């Protein structure tokens, strides 16, 4: 329905950034209110689009430094601050975004997508779990369920 | 008087983009309808902030070529097409777009030069070149 657009929007944004290595962190809210994490960012309350998500994460842009939070079908806020996880199961040699994605997913029902800036690998984190190196069909299948 | 921020936001976007010579094209709707033009762009209906404005106009991005239009404290849309002005030279495509929309509307169009980094305004068919941070600010108090 209106689920299809907006999944399509996210996949084409994720896939675009992947080819190029741009770090991204995007969290989709569900049943656990993230209002306290939204007020740490730049508020947009903007309508979700592939072009806008690309533009939010540009390697040194103002809005790039943190996480984009999604609520409703909108970009609630960009450049948000999440809490990190002192999990040993996060492979180091990475982090920063990866430790904030699992960090937020420990405390929330949310779903977080990460693109690594070093390699271009898409990860996802739910309920404290981090799954590295996902395929395009695996991300779409993971998202469609949401 | 909570529209200072918007002025503040614009003035910061433009003043940052001027010092980096980041081309830009920003029209603010005033009383005429721009809905024709808005529909031609990527809709955002976002809140106005300097950071989102600056991000829109970064050269690599898919949002930067075109004009963003503002509708009452909100970035209504980005990458919009503005009709070019047929008139008499040696200015860019960005400046021909600014004069074109200001002949058909009462909107106030700010533009930033790729080359110079100097700030311009288009209103009622006229194009004021070479503005100052404060010149633009008082000008921008075209809202009473």
DSSP letter for each residue of A60-98: TSGGGSSEEEEETTEEEEEEE-------TTS-SSS-THH
Q: Which CATH architecture has domain B1-144?
A: 3-Layer(aba) Sandwich (3.40)
**Chain A touched by B59 (CB under 8 Å):** no
Closest CA to A85 of A93, A96, A77: A96
Contact B52 A44 (CB under 8 A): yes
| Tokens 């540009």 found at | A58
Out of A45, A58, A62, the one facing B46 most closely (by C-beta) is A45
**Chain B touched by A142 (CB under 8 Å):** no
At A117, list the tokens: 């800036």
- For chains A and B, what is the number of CB pairs under 8 angstroms? 65
* Sequence-separated (6 or more) residues with CB below 8 Å from residue A39: A77
Closest CA to A125 of A111, A137, A115: A111
CA geometry: angle at A139 spanning A44 and A15, to 5°? 65
Distance CA A71, CA A142 (A): 17
Rg of chain A, C-alpha, whole Å: 14
Are A12 and A53 in contact by the 8 Å Cβ rule? The answer is no
- CA of B47 vs chain A CAs: smallest distance (Å): 5
Residue A45: closest C-alpha in chain B: B46
The distance between the two most distant Cα atoms of chain B, rounded to a whole number of Å, is: 40
Are A111 and A126 in contact by the 8 Å Cβ rule? The answer is yes
With respect to CATH, is domain A1-146 assigned 1.25.40.10? no
Helix H or strand E encompassing B133: helix B133-140
**Chain A touched by B136 (CB under 8 Å):** no
**Chain A touched by B42 (CB under 8 Å):** yes
């Amino acid at each position: 329905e209106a689920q299809q657009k907006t999944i399509e929007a996210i996949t084409k944004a994720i896939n675009y950034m992947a080819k190029r290595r741009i770090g991204a962190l995007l969290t989709i809210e569900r049943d656990t209110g993230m209002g306290d994490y939204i007020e740490t960012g730049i508020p947009l309350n903007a309508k979700v689009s592939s072009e806008l998500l690309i533009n939010i994460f540009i390697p040194n842009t103002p809005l790039h430094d943190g996480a984009v939070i999604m609520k409703n079908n909108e970009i609630a806020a960009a450049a948000c601050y999440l809490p990190l996880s002192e999990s040993p199961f996060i492979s180091k040699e990475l982090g920063t975004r990866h430790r904030a994605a699992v960090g937020i997913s420990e405390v929330t029902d949310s779903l977080t997508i990460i693109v690594s800036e070093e390699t271009g690998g898409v990860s996802v984190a739910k309920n404290g779990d981090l799954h590295r190196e996902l395929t395009e069909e695996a991300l779409k299948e993971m998202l469609e369920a949401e």
